[PDB]
Design a protein around this ligand. Structure first.
Ligand SMILES: CCCCCCCCCCCCCCCCCC(=O)OC[C@H](COP(=O)([O-])OCC(O)COP(=O)([O-])OC[C@@H](COC(=O)CCCCCCCCCCCCCCCCC)OC(=O)CCCCCCCCCCCCCCCCC)OC(=O)CCCCCCCCCCCCCCCCC
Ligand SMILES: CCCCCCCCCCCCCCCCCC(=O)OC[C@H](COP(=O)([O-])OCC(O)COP(=O)([O-])OC[C@@H](COC(=O)CCCCCCCCCCCCCCCCC)OC(=O)CCCCCCCCCCCCCCCCC)OC(=O)CCCCCCCCCCCCCCCCC
Ligand SMILES: CCCCCCCCCCCCCCCCCC(=O)OC[C@H](COP(=O)([O-])OCC[N+](C)(C)C)OC(=O)CCCCCCCCCCCCCCCCC
Ligand SMILES: CCCCCCCCCCCCCCCCCC(=O)OC[C@H](COP(=O)(O)OCCN)OC(=O)CCCCCCCCCCCCCCCCC
Ligand SMILES: CCCCCCCCCCCCO[C@@H]1O[C@H](CO)[C@@H](O[C@H]2O[C@H](CO)[C@@H](O)[C@H](O)[C@H]2O)[C@H](O)[C@H]1O
Ligand SMILES: CCCCCCCCCCCCO[C@@H]1O[C@H](CO)[C@@H](O[C@H]2O[C@H](CO)[C@@H](O)[C@H](O)[C@H]2O)[C@H](O)[C@H]1O
Ligand SMILES: CCCCCCCCCCCCO[C@@H]1O[C@H](CO)[C@@H](O[C@H]2O[C@H](CO)[C@@H](O)[C@H](O)[C@H]2O)[C@H](O)[C@H]1O
Ligand SMILES: CCCCCCCCCCCCO[C@@H]1O[C@H](CO)[C@@H](O[C@H]2O[C@H](CO)[C@@H](O)[C@H](O)[C@H]2O)[C@H](O)[C@H]1O
Ligand SMILES: CCCCCCCCCCCCO[C@@H]1O[C@H](CO)[C@@H](O[C@H]2O[C@H](CO)[C@@H](O)[C@H](O)[C@H]2O)[C@H](O)[C@H]1O
Ligand SMILES: CCCCCCCCCCCCO[C@@H]1O[C@H](CO)[C@@H](O[C@H]2O[C@H](CO)[C@@H](O)[C@H](O)[C@H]2O)[C@H](O)[C@H]1O
Ligand SMILES: CCCCCCCCCCCCO[C@@H]1O[C@H](CO)[C@@H](O[C@H]2O[C@H](CO)[C@@H](O)[C@H](O)[C@H]2O)[C@H](O)[C@H]1O
Ligand SMILES: CCCCCCCCCCCCO[C@@H]1O[C@H](CO)[C@@H](O[C@H]2O[C@H](CO)[C@@H](O)[C@H](O)[C@H]2O)[C@H](O)[C@H]1O
Lengths: 606, 63, 171, 459, 98, 52
């Protein structure tokens, strides 16, 4: 308890020390990026000790060290839940962040603000670890919005670029809409359970949890970028590639799914929530994978893959398998961060070229990047016994053996096939064929920072899934009996995707011109959702803001009905009173009228 | 900008360091009060109902 | 130790004895020994030093006792001098009752964590005690408003007592 | 309270007897020392307020407001001394005198134990504020702004005076301690409907209430920087403080009299947040932000629950430091480009890096980023309003979305993008300006560590 | 028109005093103004004031209430009494209407 | 006391004077010193008043 509790806090304290040094001018800014990277590597080592203790005996504890505030009967303490989800996510997140940070030393070498970049990456990580170990909802909210703000700051890294500022504000906007559900859940739990603590919520176990869980789902819809609040994640590609790798594997996008996992004691009993998340996940995974089929920006293809993988996780929540969903978070972190670092390696070597149509012939020119890309692609598609297979395969065969929506199951299976198609697109168009890039060749992947960072995540994309699966305790009843055609479904549809993708890819080399189909434009333009919503909604809101709220009401009608009317009457009355002829005859004639009406009408004389 | 931040750091530490050192010596050599039952017939002063010496000093001197 | 075990109960601890069924060395065992030598030992000596200083300067602080004064029930109406004391007493008891509900809530949360996957059955006593105390607290203090007072609490009680009389009258 | 009233008065002889080149140094130094001693007011008890004499008392509601008031006077002096540099020496001393006299009326207003004494001091703040706006504002419209400020307040204050005197005639006392024990319920009648309105309309105009807010965009924009700092930070809180006290004697009639004003606020905040999205004047944008935030305070005071009173108290303190910082930030730009137009100077983060950090920190506190006390207050109010009616989560949630959009829109438009080519007088930020920014944000962020001292009497 | 002075030119404090702190034109007054703001603002009010607040003696007696509640819970559970009763005031002292 | 720094005692003296006047106010509000039901007690052999 003393070592477990002590070591699980140094990890969090260790990560803040570079922040304290920077903010307190006590550092040698010579190689601050190396300092930050070194601290992350040491945090990973210290985080393994608590995890090994959990692996050994399932030891878990809650630390409520600091009493912050008591609001009548709601005591709020700084608390950390060191449980199954915390003890496995933290070492994975640190290990992936260790590679991303070493990679970013090479990738952001030329940046004049690289020191600030590494500080922001570290804050991004600290806010995610606050989120993942939070024991009460208020502490969770701190990390929930912390990653949201760091995301805003990093996506808009190149702040001279109008597109980077639009994309950054878009991320805040979509995540703030999701945060309405978070605030809703907090208010319901406080009102109905008198707690924001996760322990009291589960002990009381509310039966009518429709409203709190709908709020939690809405929060997850925004953070995890599910259909409806999805467009911001592809737009987040405006950021430097290291941001995309970290924002897509760890940190932001996984927080939405993690929030629903943390509340599985509630959702596991509420069928109506399971149906909603299942259908929300199924439309997301299908729709975004469909979008990736025709993208030409390499970062956007990988970005839409993350959206489709997060949709798959929501489906797993929707079929009451929170632990499989968590496993997919952990395995996904490895090969998705590797894929982004591989694309960054290609983009850097081709002078910031991101269109796959201007790549080609890089299979032999960039051998190590090629190997990592193929390993990352095979892991993504569920190649047997790579890291991806140990989560994705169990999810698919747990979904076709469940009591489940048939459309959601069928849509999920098609998305698995689409996963093999857009994966083949990247390999075919980036690596194969003849080079299509400019004539001054500058390819070079020989920096040790680049090689070592990818090499560690390559070892992770091969064995990490096998290691984790064989060390985590069982918490369900794995359903291992099924017909052959349900067992091998994921494997088969994946193979069909590769074959169909290859034929489609090879037909681009024929000398035939074909007019675009309606479905091709629908996929390419993202179902027209950003084209319509991001013009219509801003226009209606912004026009109302000016025409009605500001002009009609504030500058006219609220002026007209009070100050302008009152003051106009006073002016008119003044002119009536003071416009007189100065004639003695008229004033004294008015005296006689006053005396008469004073007696005849008002009887002032009686 | 750099001059302002150096001035900001200097003037915070100008009192912050003596305070942090002063607090540490108080916590080490003076220490906290121990909780005891009110002796019979004894009327504690209003500042004797607080644990930390600095809290006791604040109560006695000002409040 | 430091707190009363009765106010904050904790069931007896039952840790199983090590039963290694592997020839391999346990990394946790050697990490624990290193932690004791490199962390616990030097930390303990630094504390033992500090405790030697606190023993040379031993002084006491006390828990304030508040004598009971008449309640607002005994106060003649608009008699501020007696109303003030009863009102101050009622406010002191209100804060204490808030902390009582916090103690019962802290027992409940500790049990839920301690019992693990068996909490739904092993924390039924703490759930019941929490339910009873929250019911009592709600009756005393709920719906009084921001401008709550002993007078408003009494009116809420009288309304509740009147309904209880009527319901019995039905019987 | 004489240990704060007397030294605050002594600031006036200090300023008038100073050397001509030390008026700012002396007044700023000694107003900071007064600010230091104000911390002795935090000797608060769980049951009893701190009752000094027959005239003045302090409780957890007035104490944080007093500490904010005395802290702002030093900050208003530093903010002012640049644009008054060319001013005649005696007119500089008079300007400082108005600020000191405003502080004197404020610290007595927040501690007066009798409501009619509160009324007189509540009203006495009009005079120095009006003089500051009209004498030392820059534009032609400052004269009209003073008239709107004066008559919007007085139109509500005069009915309040009649109501208070009527309450004293019938109850026999206006001392607030007495009103806690002698209070009687208000039964329905057209007579009591108008007693309620006369007791609440003066405070609603000061907040301001949506519909009665037109004076504030004019006054908060035409005023000199110091005038805007006090108007936003403190004077708006006289309305909130007054409501928090007088609602004691209005029950249970507040149950149904609150409905028209809760509706004006819930819808008002969404209307005034949306206005900020299309504002062309940076100071005007900030002013309309204050209306949106103070709408929450009005709702929290009216629904009258323990959580909403804690949230209202936190919001008033947090808004005071944030809104004051934003006006000061916008003033620093204005002192360089001599225009309030927001789109005029862009990409300023490229030319003024550190000052862009203050812009970010000010913006984050404005959009209520947790665990800032801005979020703490705004969250507590949302928790209590949800219980009042669950559907209010929709309006609170929408306002939180819109507030982030305009908070970051102001940050993006002024600090990011490309710098305006023809603006070539953006000198580096002065030490005075950097220190003035950090004296808002640092105390604001420190209070997160110990938020209980700004949660009011119901903590 | 009329006889009026033209608008005076803008004065950049850094041209005469590159080390300007932005307080005063006079370099000696300018340094003193910065000193009082920083020392009295940061060193005194913020640093010492924060220390004062941290060591406030049991602000609003929340710590006494927790100690008192523990004493009551211990006494009530030992003697078999209820932890908390629904009635705040003893009903023997109340006279219901009707 | 110097010709250049005598003005810096005005505000400190106002605080001392205000502090003093506040204490003298407390001397007009002793009607219930050692007389409230909550705190009424006996005087310690050497004591004169419970609070001054
Ligand atoms: C008791 C008495 C104590 C007094 C108070 C003590 C604190 C004040 C220390 C004063 C001395 C500090 C100093 O010397 O500054 C050096 C420090 C480093 O020098 P620099 O690199 O040249 O900075 C110049 C750039 O402007 C730097 O710009 P930048 O963007 O690179 O970094 C500045 C940073 C502003 O500062 C920070 O926020 C750092 C991260 C938080 C720590 O801005 C941000 O990072 C914005 C995001 C902040 C994270 C928000 C995400 C949510 C997290 C919520 C979790 C809360 C858990 C608790 O300068 C500053 O950052 C100035 C900021 C001063 C305000 C501190 C605000 C703390 C929050
Ligand atoms: C900023 C605002 C500052 C406001 C003014 C300062 C207020 C103040 O003084 O209170 C400070 C407070 C003073 O407490 P106290 O009431 O005076 O102590 C009463 C005891 O009887 C004290 O008695 P004691 O004998 O136990 O402690 C005395 C101690 C000396 O301790 C001190 O006095 C340090 C004072 C430092 C002042 C703060 C600078 O003696 C030692 O030499 C300890 C040596 C340990 C090495 C072995 O001390 C601190 O809290 C300093 C920090 C403590 C270390 C940090 C603990 C680990 C952090 C865990 C949370 C992070 C978890 C990971 C998540 C990370 C996020 C991602
Ligand atoms: C490292 C991990 C990353 C965490 C982020 C860093 C922050 C944590 C570092 C600090 C840790 C130490 C700590 O928190 O203890 C502090 C403690 C809080 O923790 P505490 O309550 O346990 O206090 C510790 C001391 N004992 C044990 C005796 C209680 O105190 C404070 O928070 C100080 C409060 C400062 C607020 C006062 C502001 C100054 C007022 C000036 C007046 C003018 C301002 C304007 C007026 C506004 C209206 C009021
Ligand atoms: C939902 C929560 C939301 C929170 C939002 C705010 C976040 C702000 C960032 C938090 C920073 C970390 C806070 C934890 C660190 C400790 C904080 C602290 O001040 O410890 C003092 C501790 C308080 O005691 P406690 O009973 O728990 O609570 C008192 C009520 N304030 O008293 C003690 O226990 C004594 C500790 C003494 C330790 C001595 C060791 C010093 C070693 C040298 C260090 C240098
Ligand atoms: C509450 C906090 C409790 C823990 C307090 C411990 C404080 C000890 C601080 C030691 C120095 C920290 O600040 C900083 O540390 C790192 C590592 O040594 C140093 O950094 C040095 O090593 C790193 C990597 O090894 C290099 O990238 C860097 O080029 C080099 O300067 C800085 O020069 C030093 O300024
Ligand atoms: C879970 C992971 C599963 C991974 C599965 C990986 C792919 C499995 C094999 C997919 C199909 C193999 O490809 C099959 O054989 C050869 C390639 O050798 C192709 O042959 C092709 O060669 C040339 C390329 O130079 C094309 O221009 C030509 O149009 C076509 O004839 C066939 O068109 C295809 O039917
Ligand atoms: C809602 C409750 C309380 C409301 C009380 C409101 C009473 C009125 C307060 C403001 C009094 C200002 O009185 C006067 O108003 C008008 C506009 O309104 C201003 O006049 C200005 O607007 C008018 C019409 O919009 C123009 O014709 C005129 O050219 C322009 O100067 C005057 O400069 C001002 O002297
Ligand atoms: C709820 C009670 C509210 C009580 C509020 C107190 C009332 C104060 C009354 C001030 C009356 C004088 O306000 C007067 O308003 C008119 C507005 O038409 C202004 O007049 C202005 O607009 C009119 C037409 O719009 C023009 O003809 C005129 O040239 C222009 O100056 C006067 O310049 C101003 O003197
Ligand atoms: C570093 C920041 C400082 C902030 C400003 C605070 C300055 C003063 C702080 C500490 C003052 C001394 O603290 C004081 O120490 C003595 C210990 O002897 C305590 O007093 C106790 O011990 C002494 C004997 O030694 C006896 O009076 C008696 O046994 C008991 O009262 C006080 O209860 C405590 O208030
Ligand atoms: C922004 C402005 C907000 C405006 C808010 C409007 C609120 C309207 C409140 C209406 C309720 C007033 O309170 C009501 O007054 C009438 C007085 O005639 C009382 O009734 C009394 O007169 C009526 C006659 O009309 C009789 O029916 C009744 O027998 C008698 O007792 C009611 O017992 C009381 O319920
Ligand atoms: C500027 C925005 C305008 C938006 C429109 C807002 C309309 C607001 C109307 C004010 C409220 C009027 O309606 C008000 O309802 C409450 C009940 O809740 C009534 O309250 C009264 O009647 C109820 C029963 O009717 C009784 O329990 C009791 O005698 C009393 O509470 C008031 O007698 C009535 O006047
Ligand atoms: C407990 C209360 C504490 C209150 C503390 C208030 C501190 C205020 C600090 C202001 C210090 C100014 O002190 C300053 O000292 C020098 C000599 O001593 C004076 O005299 C100086 O003025 C000029 C400036 O033009 C100098 O160039 C010259 O060296 C000298 O003649 C200044 O006129 C005076 O302004």
């Amino acid at each position: 308890m003393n070592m477990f509790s002590s070591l699980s806090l140094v990890t969090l304290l260790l990560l803040t020390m570079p922040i304290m040094m920077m903010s307190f001018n006590t550092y040698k800014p010579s190689n601050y990026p190396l300092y930050v990277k070194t601290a992350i590597s040491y945090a990973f080592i210290t985080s393994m000790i608590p995890t090994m203790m959990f692996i050994h005996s399932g030891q878990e504890l809650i630390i409520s060290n600091w009493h912050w505030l008591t609001i009548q009967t709601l005591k709020l303490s700084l608390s950390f839940k060191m449980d199954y989800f915390s003890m496995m996510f933290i070492p994975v997140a640190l290990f992936v962040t260790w590679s991303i940070m070493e990679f970013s030393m090479w990738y952001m070498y030329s940046d004049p603000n690289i020191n600030k970049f590494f500080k922001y990456l570290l804050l991004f990580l600290i806010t995610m670890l606050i989120l993942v170990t939070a024991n009460n909802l208020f502490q969770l909210f701190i990390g929930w919005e912390g990653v949201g703000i760091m995301s805003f700051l990093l996506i808009g890294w190149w702040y001279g670029r109008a597109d980077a500022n639009t994309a950054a504000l878009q991320a805040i906007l979509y995540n703030r809409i999701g945060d309405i559900g978070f605030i809703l859940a907090m208010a319901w739990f406080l009102t109905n359970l008198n707690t924001w603590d996760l322990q009291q919520i589960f002990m009381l176990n509310p039966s009518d949890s429709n409203m709190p869980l709908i709020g939690l789902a809405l929060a997850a819809t925004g953070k995890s970028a599910q259909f409806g609040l999805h467009p911001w994640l592809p737009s987040a590609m405006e950021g430097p590639t290291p941001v995309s790798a970290l924002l897509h594997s760890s940190t932001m996008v996984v927080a939405g799914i993690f929030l629903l996992i943390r509340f599985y004691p509630l959702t596991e009993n509420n069928k109506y929530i399971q149906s909603i998340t299942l259908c929300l996940g199924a439309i997301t995974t299908l729709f975004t994978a469909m979008c990736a089929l025709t993208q030409n920006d390499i970062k956007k293809i990988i970005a839409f893959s993350t959206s489709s993988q997060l949709g798959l996780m929501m489906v797993t929540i929707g079929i009451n398998q929170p632990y499989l969903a968590f496993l997919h978070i952990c395995t996904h972190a490895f090969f998705k961060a590797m894929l982004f670092m591989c694309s960054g390696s290609i983009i850097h070597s081709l002078n910031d070229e991101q269109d796959i149509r201007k790549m080609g012939g890089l299979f032999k020119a960039m051998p190590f990047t090629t190997t990592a890309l193929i390993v990352g692609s095979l892991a993504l598609t569920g190649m047997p016994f790579l890291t991806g297979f140990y989560s994705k395969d169990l999810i698919i065969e747990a979904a076709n053996t469940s009591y489940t929506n048939a459309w959601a199951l069928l849509m999920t299976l098609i998305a698995t096939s689409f996963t093999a198609i857009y994966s083949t697109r990247i390999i075919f168009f980036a690596l194969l064929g003849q080079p299509r890039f400019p004539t001054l060749v500058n390819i070079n992947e020989n920096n040790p920072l680049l090689i070592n960072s990818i090499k560690r995540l390559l070892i992770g994309s091969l064995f990490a899934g096998y290691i984790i699966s064989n060390n985590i305790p069982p918490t369900t009843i794995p359903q291992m009996t099924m017909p052959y055609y349900l067992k091998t479904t994921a494997l088969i549809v994946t193979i069909l995707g590769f074959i169909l993708a290859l034929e489609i890819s090879n037909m681009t080399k024929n000398l035939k011109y074909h007019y675009p189909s309606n479905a091709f434009k629908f996929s390419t333009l993202l179902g027209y959702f950003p084209t319509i919503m991001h013009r219509l909604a801003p226009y209606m809101n912004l026009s109302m803001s000016q025409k009605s709220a500001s002009s009609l009401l504030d500058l006219i009608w609220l002026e007209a009905i009070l100050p302008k009317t009152i003051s106009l009457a006073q002016m008119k009355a003044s002119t009536l009173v003071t416009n007189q002829k100065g004639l003695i005859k008229l004033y004294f004639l008015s005296f006689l009228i006053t005396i008469l009406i004073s007696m005849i009408l008002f009887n002032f004389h009686e | 900008d750099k001059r302002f931040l150096k001035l900001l750091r200097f003037y915070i530490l100008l009192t912050g360091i003596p305070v942090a050192i002063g607090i540490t010596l108080i916590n080490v050599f003076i220490g906290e009060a121990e909780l005891a039952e009110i002796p019979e017939g004894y009327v504690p002063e209003h500042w004797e109902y607080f644990k930390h010496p600095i809290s006791r000093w604040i109560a006695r001197t000002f409040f | 130790d430091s707190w009363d075990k009765d106010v904050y109960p904790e069931p007896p601890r039952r840790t199983p004895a090590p039963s290694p069924q592997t020839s391999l060395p346990n990394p946790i065992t050697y990490l624990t020994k290193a932690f004791d030598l490199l962390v616990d030992r030097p930390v303990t000596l630094v504390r033992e030093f500090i405790e030697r200083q606190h023993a040379k300067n031993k002084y006491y602080y006390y828990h304030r006792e508040f004598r009971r004064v008449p309640d607002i029930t005994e106060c003649q109406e608009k008699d501020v001098l007696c109303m003030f004391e009863a009102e101050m007493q009622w406010r002191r008891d209100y804060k204490v009752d808030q902390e009582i509900v916090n103690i019962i809530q802290e027992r409940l949360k500790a049990c839920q964590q301690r019992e693990g996957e068996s909490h739904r059955q092993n924390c039924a006593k703490e759930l019941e005690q929490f339910t009873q105390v929250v019911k009592a607290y709600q009756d005393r203090y709920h719906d009084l408003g921001a401008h709550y007072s002993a007078r408003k609490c009494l009116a809420k009680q009288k309304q509740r007592m009147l309904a209880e009389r009527k319901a019995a009258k039905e019987a | 309270m004489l240990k704060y009233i007397i030294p605050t008065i002594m600031l006036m002889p200090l300023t008038w007897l100073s050397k001509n080149n030390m008026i700012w140094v002396n007044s700023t130094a000694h107003s900071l020392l007064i600010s230091f001693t104000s911390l002795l007011l935090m000797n608060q008890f769980g049951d009893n307020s701190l009752n000094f004499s027959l005239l003045f008392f302090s409780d957890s509601l007035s104490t944080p407001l007093l500490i904010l008031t005395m802290w702002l006077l030093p900050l208003m002096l530093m903010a002012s001394q640049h644009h008054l540099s060319k001013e005649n020496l005696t007119r500089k001393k008079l300007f400082i005198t108005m600020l000191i006299s405003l502080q004197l009326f404020l610290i007595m207003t927040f501690t007066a134990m009798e409501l009619i004494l509160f009324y007189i001091l509540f009203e006495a703040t009009l005079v120095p504020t009006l003089i500051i706006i009209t004498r030392w504002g820059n534009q032609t419209e400052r004269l009209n702004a003073g008239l709107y400020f004066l008559f919007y307040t007085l139109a509500g204050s005069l009915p309040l005076l009649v109501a208070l005197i009527y309450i004293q005639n019938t109850v026999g006392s206006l001392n607030f301690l007495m009103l806690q024990y002698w209070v009687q319920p208000v039964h329905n009648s057209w007579s009591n409907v108008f007693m309620w309105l006369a007791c609440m309309m003066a405070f609603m105009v000061k907040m301001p209430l949506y519909g009665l807010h037109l004076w504030l965009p004019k006054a908060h924009v035409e005023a000199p920087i110091a005038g805007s700092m006090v108007l936003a930070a403190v004077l708006l809180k006289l309305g909130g403080y007054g409501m928090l006290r007088i609602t004691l004697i209005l029950n249970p009639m507040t149950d149904f009299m609150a409905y028209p004003f809760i509706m004006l606020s819930l819808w008002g905040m969404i209307m005034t947040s949306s206005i900020c999205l299309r504002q062309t004047d940076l100071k005007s944008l900030i002013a309309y932000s204050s209306v949106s935030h103070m709408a929450l305070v009005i709702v929290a005071i009216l629904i009258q629950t323990p959580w909403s009173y804690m949230g209202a108290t936190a919001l008033m303190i947090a808004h005071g430091l944030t809104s004051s910082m934003l006006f000061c930030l916008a003033n620093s730009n204005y002192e360089r480009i001599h225009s309030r137009t927001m789109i005029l100077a862009r990409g300023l983060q490229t030319l003024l890096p550190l000052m862009a950090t203050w812009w970010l920190l000010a913006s984050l506190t404005n959009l209520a980023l947790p665990p800032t006390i801005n979020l703490i207050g705004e969250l507590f109010v949302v928790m209590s309003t949800f219980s009042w009616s669950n559907i209010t989560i929709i309006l609170m949630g929408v306002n939180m979305v819109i507030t982030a959009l305009y908070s970051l829109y102001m940050l993006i438009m002024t600090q990011r993008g490309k710098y305006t080519y023809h603006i070539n007088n953006i000198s580096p930020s002065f030490t005075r300006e950097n220190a003035l920014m950090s004296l808002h944000i640092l105390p604001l962020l420190l209070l997160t560590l110990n938020p209980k001292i700004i949660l009011g009497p119901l903590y | 028109r009329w006889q009026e002075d033209p608008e005076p030119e803008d004065e950049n404090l850094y041209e005469k005093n590159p080390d300007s702190h932005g307080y005063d034109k006079d370099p000696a007054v300018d340094i003193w103004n910065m000193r009082v703001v920083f020392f009295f603002g940061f060193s005194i009010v913020l640093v010492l004031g924060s220390t004062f607040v941290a060591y406030l003696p049991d602000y609003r007696m929340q710590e006494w209430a927790r100690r008192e509640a523990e004493r009551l819970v211990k006494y009530r559970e030992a003697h078999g009494l209820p932890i908390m009763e629904s009635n705040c005031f003893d009903p023997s002292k109340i006279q219901l209407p009707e | 006391v110097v010709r250049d720094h005598w003005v810096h005692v005005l505000v400190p003296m106002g605080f001392v004077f205000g502090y003093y006047l506040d204490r003298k106010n407390d001397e007009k509000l002793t009607a219930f010193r050692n007389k409230s039901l909550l705190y009424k007690r006996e005087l310690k052999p050497n004591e004169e008043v419970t609070w001054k």
